[PDB]
């Protein structure tokens, strides 16, 4: 007869996690996986992971409340808009939200608010534990500064179609045909990473054939000659060689007018180093706070 409506799934310090919130995040991750179910095919492990997610969220929220961080509705305004691709946000966003979960308009904003609170506290503490030495940002940028001899640096990927030491004419023809087909498919908009994974015999095949940033003059002579007139996004044909056919792709390029004789580079090194240290400190803080708190799972 009686129907269970809601219950406490876990107790976290003075707060609680409700089965309703657990179901809400269940639906959230199910929708996320609907796009690609390979992201989260697990069910029980996913449920426990979400349990931990809500536990950490409650810990962080209680800590932030203790400190006194607060957010106004004015900060909420706009902090959602200009994000949905071309959406007419703050009027059309609300109307579309009615069709998915917007039974009550406030729900969405109350969630957004909460999330911002947690972010602001996390960022505050994690960055407070970070320490950066200039010597470190200098060393990280020194490699690129030395490698910036070229006025333009190219991000490149490569694919190899192999040949034996003593190939036959038929083998050469087959390799050339395969390379030309791959080049045509790439120029037709096919994913270069998938093609490299499927066909490339190079060690970077499983990595999508990505070679990364490089100075053109430091590349193999054939690569330097072929790429002398290449630009971002270009697909270049096969290159014959005693060991097979080589295919090259240009992903991105960078450069500046400053005379490198490094020059306005340590800022980017600072960004990357800060990102890495933030990740490490966040992991260490997310587990320093889980150990130190009181948690009891009553999910039973």
């Amino acid at each position: 007869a009686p129907q269970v409506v809601d219950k406490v799934a876990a107790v976290v310090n003075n707060g609680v996690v409700l089965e309703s919130d657990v179901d809400g995040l269940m639906q959230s991750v199910k929708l996320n996986a609907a796009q690609a179910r390979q992201q989260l095919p697990d069910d029980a492990t996913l449920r426990h992971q979400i349990m931990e997610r809500l536990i950490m969220d409650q810990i962080i929220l209680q800590m932030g409340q203790k400190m006194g961080v607060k957010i106004s509705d004015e900060q909420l305004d706009q902090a959602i808009a200009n994000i949905a691709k071309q959406n007419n946000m703050t009027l059309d966003q609300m109307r579309s939200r009615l069709a998915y979960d917007g039974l009550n308009y406030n729900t969405y904003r109350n969630q957004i608010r909460k999330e911002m609170i947690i972010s602001e506290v996390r960022n505050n503490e994690v960055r407070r534990r970070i320490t950066i030495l200039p010597q470190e940002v200098e060393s990280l940028a020194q490699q690129v500064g030395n490698q910036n001899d070229a006025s333009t640096e190219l991000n490149l990927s490569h694919i190899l179609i192999p040949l034996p030491e003593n190939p036959t004419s038929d083998q050469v023809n087959e390799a050339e045909s395969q390379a030309r087909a791959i080049v045509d498919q790439a120029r037709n908009g096919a994913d270069f990473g998938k093609l490299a994974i499927a066909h490339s015999a190079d060690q970077q095949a499983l990595n999508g054939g990505q070679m990364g940033w490089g100075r053109i003059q430091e590349l193999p002579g054939i690569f330097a000659q072929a790429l002398s007139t290449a630009k971002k996004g270009d697909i270049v044909g096969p290159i014959r060689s005693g060991v097979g056919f080589h295919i090259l792709k240009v992903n991105d390029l960078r450069g500046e007018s400053k005379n490198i004789s490094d020059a306005a580079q340590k800022d980017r090194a600072y960004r990357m180093l800060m990102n890495r240290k933030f990740s490490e400190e966040a992991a260490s803080w997310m587990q320093e706070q889980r150990a130190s708190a009181y948690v009891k799972i009553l999910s039973n």
């Binding site: 007869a1 009686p2 129907q3 269970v4 409506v5 809601d6 219950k7 406490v8 107790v11 310090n13 003075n14 707060g15 609680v16 409700l18 309703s20 919130d21 009550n104 729900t107 009181y294 009891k296 009553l298």
Partner: protein
Amino acid sequence: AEGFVVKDIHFEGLQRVAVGAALLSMPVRTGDTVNDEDISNTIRALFATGNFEDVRVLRDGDTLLVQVKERPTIASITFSGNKSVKDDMLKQNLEASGVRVGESLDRTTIADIEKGLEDFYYSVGKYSASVKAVVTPLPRNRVDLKLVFQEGVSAEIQQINIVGNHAFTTDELISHFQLRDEVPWWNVVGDRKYQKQKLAGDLETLRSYYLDRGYARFNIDSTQVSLTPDKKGIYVT
């Protein structure tokens, strides 16, 4: 609507808290239009009162059934395993933290009290000591708190070193100290046990000793308290 019309609200499990207080703690007053979020907020508020260990809300269609499990009341406090700290000092330490016979058991404070006692054992120099609490459920929603003490062997000061004393000698300076680096065979009334408060008083005594001789600039740059990896060889510098 949604949650249906609430005709009446019944509480279950209430032992100490009056139904009036619980009703006052809920945000909904048979509003006749209750949604799921309202029920969630009601649960959150009821738990925020701090009187319940578990809360659950069920719907009969017309009736809102609030099932709560009140946090157990303390029946008795038992100390076992302690050979140095007396039960009296422990019992007064309990009342400071709210653990007292006849009151409720704040589970979230358990860790706190435990750590506090361990800290005390570390102040005396009894490192490796543990103080673990066991809560056994007694009927009629009661509990008995037993604090299992497992004290180790007290660490003994191996050395007291002063670095930078060129006018006086380490022996003379530490002869006035409360902490003893060594005890003569004839003296069987003192030991080499450590205590933080005694160390602070000792630093003050050293400062007074150097200031009473007209130096007027004596400064303790730093103080390091080390400990052997076996945790029975505390060192002072």
